[PDB]
């Protein structure tokens, strides 16, 4: 396990090229752009998965066993520059033209053969399996409504693939008259027992919605740790800790041999200056110099002076949410979810605690020790209710926010300041400015400029092309538009506030 | 005229070589380097030898000169600094070091030619010559030095200041 | 981020009572002498092991001898100056530990205050000090004269000397009084004598004269001093301001200074790995050997370190890159408003970074203060926040963050916290627990959990004034790691042939909630244990 | 033997040297390395043998010469010029930890003397020519200077200095 496999299955029928509204993207272009975005995300995150793009409904074919109307554009391999370049070549109006020219659209297909080809693609991989997943990008809800023999074979093959271990997922796009899953699917797609019976994604009509749905349902959640939440010494339940936010760093360079470019796997050794031999871990000590005094301790005691409590979460009490201050932020929050695989019955107690904490508007003050020999921090478990948007995408998971609370040592002093108030007229003018400069904020509305520039340069270099073209930063304010929107309010505010001499 | 700019160090019975201050025809530069107090630096003195190709050789440290026997050759002064002065385990695979003015520690703006070879002591009088050079540089380090700046790409990036005493010479062939 | 401070020191005189009555024993509470020793030891350990430049003097009163420069015969008797103004060291710590003994006499604490004032006045002539402080550790169980009081107050005001008072008891009003007694935890007006009441009245009036109503906040008990940073309150320094201009557009600029409000405190010194016998670093040579990924053992020179980058399944070497090719040219240091948005749109779970900034107007700028006040009040009235771009300098990576108003009775400012980028978000999906039939709690379980939550409340609506009181404020508690480390270091410095001592009891007491919550929990906890079966997996 | 010559008037010309050899005045063209406390990028000063500094240019030309700002040391010029905030002296003090001067290194500074100040249009033209010449050479030839502010931890300001030594006629 550890190397997930994902196959992108894109329909190539005629309906995937009608755009209706002239200002809306073609569903085919939506699919291509979503796949290319997934590739970019995988390379940026440096995540080693296997991805494949397959088209069905074409006249040309490239699959191993020469079935009809199944082209394997890309097999299972790590993402790279040339695959993304080819997908970009399929993008747009000219991309659609060249796609149709090189792989015609509109033909008879059978879903059983498509799923068989995908299963063969999964089998052909040598570097283990872990999670196997297929995604359908279609806008036809009844593909074999006129051939019951094909439909039964399709259901049988889908059941066989699901039994093998492959997870089938649907990415149904906007269709005139709505998309109905209950017609043909719900007998093919994978349903996670009773937890995922209802609450299915709605049909996608815009690129961002489809991208969010694709990213939400292919990323396996990895837990940082699996701690124990103890109400007291007896009642202990098992929880998982997650990092829903994490700073994205620019990958450091790797060392490669001149003879063959490959990782080196560096090692560290301890050597003695005089003897020139290896040093045992018990043949050295730790020192600290204070003024002119040397304080000597062994490694075990250095670890022992940091040991307070066993790892886990210890409940200290319950505190009203109004007592938590927004300006006391210390370090990024974590997420706490129940774990049933370690302690049985943890989920029921977790659910009851969440329900009652939400009802009473209270947070659980706890003591937090991540691992062994670490001094504790005080944390607040703030209850968090599940929230879905109009596309039924989970924008807020149910569980607990682990909020780190500062110590007295982390609170710094402010200098003395004389309070100067502003007259109501100045406040009114600034209110007018604020109203004229209003927008809507989303958590995913800005991109890191340094990372984007770095990866654009790397992409240009890996393709052996010339210098790329710099892009305008999206975190830099648009001063001109702001000035036109504000008008003479700035001048009037300056007249009221700023003295003429300064 | 009580000051001196060019000195002579005797190598053997017949050939005594010259130590200059300016790079007006020399090929090898010895740098005696001192680092002021910092919260990420624990090594104070490092001596290096730099050619016109930018290749650098570790010569001496706080433990003396017997480290030239190890023959530690790197391709840049920043690499030597990260290898030796930044021996911290966290700081090893952490960041890099660079000069924002494109100025070398020995040749300033002068272009670096393609690497040809690296001078390295082979004889026994070579160690004596290197010891004499190190002693002469250390004798003049309290009043003759220049400032050098390197930038570490930390968060936020930091600036490291070095006191460098430079001596230019040609080793006879 | 790091804290940068101005570089000013302070002179601190610790006036300690060692008299007869400050040694009494009681079955359950330590003597005031021992608690004062603990507080003084805490202060000095922090000063010594942080390597501050503050100078500390120690003046004992109630001693059996007399070593003060104002003796003159039958005046200011039984007052010793045990340590003059100098940097603290381990000799002072050893003296506090096992060289200073309780006395058998009594001294007026006003005379001791006069002696401490004389120490400050005559021992600071040749040096520079931004702050002069006196901390008094007494029990107020001695007769005193009221004659020199006005001169004392006038001298304190003229010379700009601050005062803090530490007593065995608290200054609470209508506390209501209340298993084993615990020191340093969060949870006695009739237990004090008349002389203590008179001393308390004099102390209160001196504190009111010196500062005002807020001066009563500066009388502490020995118990709460060990669980607070109160002894360092008048020698703390704020960081050097970050100066910039908040820009709304290309025509509105406000001169601002930003200070660090929250920043994690970390240990300044690491451990140096030294040889077991020589105890020197020079005998250890640490080297990195990668050689080859296979079992060949071939010598590898450092000339082969060319390195390269990875773009998925391909490698781009450093031979094809340039230093100037890959560098985001920042436009410079900036604090620019991208715009304004509703407060509910910016949530706490998306806060990132390792600092919080407080933004005030630039010093000595009336127009900037008025403009910033207008912005803050406009944001507060409309319930809005500012999304801003923040760049520390021309080299730091640009950030996007949120500035929200902060209005208090004595100051108003903006608060800046970093916000995430697109690449920093992980979109996971979790199963709903409310809509789960397998994990649906019953009514009885919900009632039991409700009882537990009601019984473990750490807040109280006292006085029926719609005021909510915190019974366990953890943001006023110091980090126990620093005290534990200092204690262990001092024990190793003074007792080389002994093992490290266990954690002090008051550290444990200050890390735990008041005992009033424990049993109130114990009953519903027992109720819950039966209703919820928790069986560990036996894989 | 003069390293460079600048025309002063019809009669006399002024010699500019790169070394201090019997020279009274030194013009320093200074570029300040990026610091979060510094709001000014480049400046230019004239320093005499007593350490007195007259400010010449502030990246807007020689127009600030007419203000006649004279400081007792280069640290004072930095305190009163390159900081946006008001009371810079209240926060820290600037000095060189090796007792080096920006113009004379570890030499002995003379007693307080009057600083040369331009009066006539010939002087203004000469300073304009000198500033243009110094700006031309700044990209190739310069040295590093360091000032230290007594903060905890100490603050370090790095300067890139191009120096030209010369004398004025009596």
Author numbering:
A (entry chain A): 33 to 534
B (entry chain C): 159 to 331
C (entry chain B): -1 to 176, 181 to 189, 193 to 544
D (entry chain D): 162 to 331
What do the authors of the reporting publication say about this deposited model?
The Ku heterodimer, a component of the NHEJ pathway of DNA repair in the nucleus, functions as DNA sensor that detects dsDNA of viruses that replicate in the cytoplasm. Vaccinia virus expresses two proteins, C4 and C16, that inactivate DNA sensing and enhance virulence. Here we determine the structure of the C16 – Ku complex using cryoEM. Ku binds dsDNA by a preformed ring but C16 sterically blocks this access route, abrogating binding to a dsDNA end and its insertion into DNA-PK, thereby averting signalling into the downstream innate immunity system.
Out of 579,038 initial particles for the C16–Ku complex, 170,770 resulted in a map for the C16-C–Ku complex where, although the estimated average resolution was similar to the full complex, structural features were better defined. Here, the cryoEM map for the C16-C–Ku complex shows clear volumes corresponding to the Ku heterodimer, and the presence of two copies of the C-terminal domains from the vaccinia C16 protein to form a dimer without ambiguity. The C16 dimer binds as a single unit at one end of the central channel of the Ku heterodimer interacting exclusively with the Ku80 subunit. The two C16 subunits are stacked on top of each other so that the lower C16 interacts with the side and top rim of the core β-barrel domain of Ku80 that forms the base of the Ku DNA-binding channel, while the upper C16 is held over the top of the β-barrel and directed towards the large hole defined by the bridge structure that sits over the channel and forms part of the Ku heterodimer interface. The lower C16 has a substantially hydrophobic interface with Ku80, with side chains of Tyr197, Leu198, Phe246, Leu252, Phe253, Thr312, Pro314 from C16 forming a curved hydrophobic groove into which the side chains of Val 2, Ile245, His246 and Pro248 of Ku80 protrude. This is supported by polar interactions of Arg368 and Asp369 of Ku80 with Ser247, Glu248 and Glu251 of C16, Lys399 and Arg400 of Ku80 with Asp194 and Asp195 of C16, and an interaction of the phenol OH of Tyr397 of Ku80 with the aromatic ring of Tyr197 of C16. The upper C16 subunit makes surprisingly few direct interactions with the Ku heterodimer apart from a polar interaction between Asp258 and Arg400 of Ku80, which also contacts the lower C16 molecule, and glancing van der Waals contacts made by Ile231 and Ser232 of C16 with Lys307 and Glu308 from Ku80 at the top corner of the bridge. However, supported by its dimer interaction with the lower C16, it projects an intensely negatively charged plug formed by a helix-turn-helix motif from residues 233-255 into the mouth of the bridge. The tip of this plug is formed by residues from D245 to E251 containing several acidic residues that insert into the Ku ring, which itself displays a positively charged surface.
